[PDB]
């Protein structure tokens with residue numbers, strides 16, 4: 001399931017070859033081009049690495065901390081130099097400079113899926129089929145090669161580009177960076193994680209199932225919509241604490257019927273089973289009818305994407 005085609009290996013090799021020419025990352029080597037997004041911890045800027053000429057995404061995290069803590073965070077982030085996959089955003093490096101930690105990454109010209117969703121209104125099932133494959137594969141890569149789980153799957157942590165690539169970013173790899181920061185939305189957290197119980201990759205499967213439902217209907221799906229709201233979209237206010245209680249206490253969300261295929265509905269239902277033991281695992285998801293159908297579909301994701309967001 002983790003093997004790569006010719007095109008993937010070549011792109012992966014081309015990234016590392018460009019990366020090896022960068023060298024030590026320093027504050028003054030960066031020119032700000034624009035702001036890409038702002039989210040958990042800090043702001044992401046599209047930047048120019050002046051010496052190499054490489055365009056990168058630079059995430060700045062404002063943190064006032066002793067040289068002790070910052071040197072440990074930088075050392076902990078070095079793990080990301082080992083995470084080489086078509087389904088994971090490329091990492092250039094991390095450094096600290098005058099009150100802020102910088103994380104330099106591959107620039108994904110399509111931005112994140114929370115932004116694409118805002119532009120599209122809702123994302124078609126076939127496009128979501130490609131997103132699901134990429135997420136499952138990214139999570140399998142993290143689990144198999146690095147024995148780590150994502151911990152924060154959500155639309156804003158799924159990045160897309162004009163080449164039709166879909167990649168995960170912002171997975172927990174440093175405890176010290178988490179402690180010092182620490183603020184993140186808990187709205188995609190599985191019922192077991194919100195109950196402080198037994199948490200594995202199964203909790204990332206729930207977050208993926210939830211992100212897919214949001215993207216398919218064009219709305220965060222908790223609480224479920226009424227008969228009237230479903231007529232508005234297809235023709236055919238809760239405070240954060242009330243929402244987290246709703247997730248733990250009520251049946252999981254689901255796709256509306258007679259709008260989505262039964263394979264897509266079943267796929268999300270198997271990600272959203274409250275009990276993590278009954279919830280589908282990565283191995284089972286990889287062979288689910290929805291994945292096998294989406295995998296065999298020839299879907300122009302780059303085409304759909306550039307048309308939708310006006311990229312070009």
Ligand SMILES: O=c1[nH]ccc2cc(OC[C@@H]3CCNC3)c(Cl)cc12
Nearest residue numbers: 036037039057106107108111112156
């Ligand atoms: O160009 C990408 N590379 C790495 C990270 C990244 C993060 C994205 O922004 C994430 C923010 C967080 C909440 N809204 C979107 C931007 Cl839109 C592009 C990139």
